[PDB]
mmCIF file of C-alpha atoms in Angstrom:
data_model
loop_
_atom_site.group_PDB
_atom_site.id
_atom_site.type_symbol
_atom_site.label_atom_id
_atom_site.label_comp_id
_atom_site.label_asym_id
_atom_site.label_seq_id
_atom_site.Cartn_x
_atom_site.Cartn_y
_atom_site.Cartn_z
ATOM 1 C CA UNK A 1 -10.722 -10.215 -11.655
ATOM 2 C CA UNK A 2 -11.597 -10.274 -8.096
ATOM 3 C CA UNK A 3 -8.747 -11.277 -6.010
ATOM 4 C CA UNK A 4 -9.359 -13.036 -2.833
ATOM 5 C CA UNK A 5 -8.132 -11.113 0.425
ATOM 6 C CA UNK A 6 -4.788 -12.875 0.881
ATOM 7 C CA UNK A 7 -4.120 -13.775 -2.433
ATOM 8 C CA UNK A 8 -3.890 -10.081 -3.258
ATOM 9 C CA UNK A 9 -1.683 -10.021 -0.064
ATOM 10 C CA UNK A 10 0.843 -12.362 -1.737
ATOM 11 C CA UNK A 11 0.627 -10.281 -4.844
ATOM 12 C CA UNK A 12 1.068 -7.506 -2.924
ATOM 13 C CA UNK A 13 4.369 -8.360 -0.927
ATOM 14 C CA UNK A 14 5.315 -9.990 -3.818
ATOM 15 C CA UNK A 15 5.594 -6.463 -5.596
ATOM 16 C CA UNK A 16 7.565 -4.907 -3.021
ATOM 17 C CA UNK A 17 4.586 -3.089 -1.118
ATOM 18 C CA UNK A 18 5.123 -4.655 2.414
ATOM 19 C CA UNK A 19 6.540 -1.626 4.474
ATOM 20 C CA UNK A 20 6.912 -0.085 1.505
ATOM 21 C CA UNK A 21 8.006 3.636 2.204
ATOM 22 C CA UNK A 22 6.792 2.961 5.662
ATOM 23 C CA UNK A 23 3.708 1.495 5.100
ATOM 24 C CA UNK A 24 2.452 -1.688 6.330
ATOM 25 C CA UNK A 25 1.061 -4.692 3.706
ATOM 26 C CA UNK A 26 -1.713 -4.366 5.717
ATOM 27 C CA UNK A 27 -2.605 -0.659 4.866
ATOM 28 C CA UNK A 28 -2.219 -1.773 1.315
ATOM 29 C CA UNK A 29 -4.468 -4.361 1.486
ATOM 30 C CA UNK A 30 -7.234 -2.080 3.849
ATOM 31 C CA UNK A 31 -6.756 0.335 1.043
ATOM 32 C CA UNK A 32 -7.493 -2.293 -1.867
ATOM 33 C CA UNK A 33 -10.639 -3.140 -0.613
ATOM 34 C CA UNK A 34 -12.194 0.290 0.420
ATOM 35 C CA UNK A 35 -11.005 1.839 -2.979
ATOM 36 C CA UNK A 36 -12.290 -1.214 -4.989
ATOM 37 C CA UNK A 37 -13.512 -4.233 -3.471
ATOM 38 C CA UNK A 38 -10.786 -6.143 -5.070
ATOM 39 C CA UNK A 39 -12.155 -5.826 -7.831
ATOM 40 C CA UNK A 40 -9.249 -5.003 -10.757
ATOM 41 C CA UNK A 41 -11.877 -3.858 -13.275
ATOM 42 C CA UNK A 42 -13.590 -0.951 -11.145
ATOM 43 C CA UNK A 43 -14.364 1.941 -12.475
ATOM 44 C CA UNK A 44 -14.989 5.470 -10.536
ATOM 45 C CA UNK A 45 -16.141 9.054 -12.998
ATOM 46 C CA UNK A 46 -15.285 11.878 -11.117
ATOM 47 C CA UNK A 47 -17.423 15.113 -11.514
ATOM 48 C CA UNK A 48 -14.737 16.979 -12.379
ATOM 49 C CA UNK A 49 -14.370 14.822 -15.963
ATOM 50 C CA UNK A 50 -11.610 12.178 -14.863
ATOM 51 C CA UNK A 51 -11.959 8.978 -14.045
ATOM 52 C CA UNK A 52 -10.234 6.102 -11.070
ATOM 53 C CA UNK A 53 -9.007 2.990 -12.278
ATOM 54 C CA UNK A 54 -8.262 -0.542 -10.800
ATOM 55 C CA UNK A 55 -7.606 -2.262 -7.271
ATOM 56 C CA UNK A 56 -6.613 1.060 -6.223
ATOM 57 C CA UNK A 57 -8.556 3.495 -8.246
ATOM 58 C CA UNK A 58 -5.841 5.184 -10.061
ATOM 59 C CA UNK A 59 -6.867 8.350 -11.004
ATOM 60 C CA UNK A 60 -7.095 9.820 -14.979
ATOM 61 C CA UNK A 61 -6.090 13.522 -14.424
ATOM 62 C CA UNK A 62 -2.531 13.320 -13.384
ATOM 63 C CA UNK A 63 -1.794 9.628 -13.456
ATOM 64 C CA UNK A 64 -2.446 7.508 -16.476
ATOM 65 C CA UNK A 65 -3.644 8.599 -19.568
ATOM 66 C CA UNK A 66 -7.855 7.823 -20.950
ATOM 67 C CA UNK A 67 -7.615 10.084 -23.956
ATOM 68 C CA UNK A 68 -11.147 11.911 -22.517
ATOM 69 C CA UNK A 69 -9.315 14.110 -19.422
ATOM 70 C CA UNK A 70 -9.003 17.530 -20.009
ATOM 71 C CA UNK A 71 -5.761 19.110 -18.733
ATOM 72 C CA UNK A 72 -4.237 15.671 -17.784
ATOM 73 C CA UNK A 73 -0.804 14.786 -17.353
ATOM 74 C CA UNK A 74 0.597 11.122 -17.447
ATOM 75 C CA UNK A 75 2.871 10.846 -15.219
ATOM 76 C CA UNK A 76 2.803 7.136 -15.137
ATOM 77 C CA UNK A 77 3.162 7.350 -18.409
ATOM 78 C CA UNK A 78 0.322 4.589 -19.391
ATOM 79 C CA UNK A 79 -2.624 4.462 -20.552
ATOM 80 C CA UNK A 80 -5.375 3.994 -18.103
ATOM 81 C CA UNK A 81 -6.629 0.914 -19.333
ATOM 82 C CA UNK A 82 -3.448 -1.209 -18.022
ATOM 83 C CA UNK A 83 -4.533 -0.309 -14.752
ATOM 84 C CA UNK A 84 -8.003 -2.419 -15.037
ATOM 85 C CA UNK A 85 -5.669 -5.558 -15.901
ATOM 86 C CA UNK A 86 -5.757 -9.196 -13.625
ATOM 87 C CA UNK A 87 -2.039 -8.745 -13.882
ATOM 88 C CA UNK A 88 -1.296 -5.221 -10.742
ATOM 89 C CA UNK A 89 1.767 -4.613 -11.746
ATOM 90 C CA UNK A 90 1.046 -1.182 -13.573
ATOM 91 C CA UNK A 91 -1.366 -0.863 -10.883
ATOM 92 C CA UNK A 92 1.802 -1.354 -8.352
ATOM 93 C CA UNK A 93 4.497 0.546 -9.591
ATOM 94 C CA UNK A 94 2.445 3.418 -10.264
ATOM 95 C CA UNK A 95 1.184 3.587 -6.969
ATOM 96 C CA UNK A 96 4.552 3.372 -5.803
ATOM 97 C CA UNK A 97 5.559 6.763 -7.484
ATOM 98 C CA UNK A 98 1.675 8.373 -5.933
ATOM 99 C CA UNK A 99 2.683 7.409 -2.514
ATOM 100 C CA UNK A 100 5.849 9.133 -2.817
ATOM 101 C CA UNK A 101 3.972 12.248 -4.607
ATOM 102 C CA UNK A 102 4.163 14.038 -0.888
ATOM 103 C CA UNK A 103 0.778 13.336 0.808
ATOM 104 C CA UNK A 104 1.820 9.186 2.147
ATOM 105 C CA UNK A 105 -1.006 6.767 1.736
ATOM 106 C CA UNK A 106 -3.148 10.148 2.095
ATOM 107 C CA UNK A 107 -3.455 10.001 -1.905
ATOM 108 C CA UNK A 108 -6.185 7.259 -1.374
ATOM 109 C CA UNK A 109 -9.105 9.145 0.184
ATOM 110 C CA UNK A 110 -10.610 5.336 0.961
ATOM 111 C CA UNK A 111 -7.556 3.978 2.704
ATOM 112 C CA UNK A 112 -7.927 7.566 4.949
ATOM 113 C CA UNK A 113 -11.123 7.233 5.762
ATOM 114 C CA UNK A 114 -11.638 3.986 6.685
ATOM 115 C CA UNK A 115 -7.665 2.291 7.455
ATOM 116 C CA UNK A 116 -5.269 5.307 8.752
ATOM 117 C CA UNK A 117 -4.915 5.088 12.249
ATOM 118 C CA UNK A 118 -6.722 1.393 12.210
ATOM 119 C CA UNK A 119 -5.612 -1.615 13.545
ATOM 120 C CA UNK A 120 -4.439 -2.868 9.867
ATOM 121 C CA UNK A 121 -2.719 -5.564 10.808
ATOM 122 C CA UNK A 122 -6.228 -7.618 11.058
ATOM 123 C CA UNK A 123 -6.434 -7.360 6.954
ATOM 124 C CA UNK A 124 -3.177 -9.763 6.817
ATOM 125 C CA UNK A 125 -4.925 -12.639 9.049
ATOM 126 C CA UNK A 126 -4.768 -15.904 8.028
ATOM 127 C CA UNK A 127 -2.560 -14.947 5.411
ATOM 128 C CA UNK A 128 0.267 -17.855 4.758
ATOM 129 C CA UNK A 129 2.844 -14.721 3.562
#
């Protein structure tokens, strides 16, 4: 599913995200669409043999679990496919535990790269939240 910009908003706050540990909906939703478009189904292989899954590419070698990562933990304790659901829940709460893993929203190499130090507030316009 692709979700439009402020309907994943809604989903979004609706999960708890808004402000969550600090961060702004809007850095959620910045990050959403660099790491995936949107897109709940996208898919990233890594060179390194794992793989990023979902809205906000979830990756296989420490997070959820694709059976074909060598040396990978689940910590999420899910297999990977729930993550390329229309449903972002799994997507949500593991996310949750990733930006709390030490390194802030800087898990998400899109969101720094393209929303950190941004005026992020611009990705909640016309947003009826």
């Amino acid at each position: 599913k692709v979700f439009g910009r402020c309907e994943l908003a809604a989903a979004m706050k609706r999960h708890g995200l808004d402000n969550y540990r600090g961060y702004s909906l809007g850095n959620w939703v910045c990050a959403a669409k660099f790491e995936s478009n949107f897109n709940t189904q996208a898919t990233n292989r890594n060179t390194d043999g794992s793989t990023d899954y979902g809205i906000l590419q979830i990756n296989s070698r420490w997070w959820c679990n694709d059976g074909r990562t060598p040396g990978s933990r689940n910590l999420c304790n899910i297999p990977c496919s729930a993550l390329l659901s229309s449903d972002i829940t799994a997507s949500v709460n593991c996310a949750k535990k990733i930006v709390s893993d030490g390194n802030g929203m800087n898990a998400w190499v899109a969101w720094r790269n393209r929303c950190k130090g941004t005026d992020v507030q611009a990705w909640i316009r016309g947003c009826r939240l």
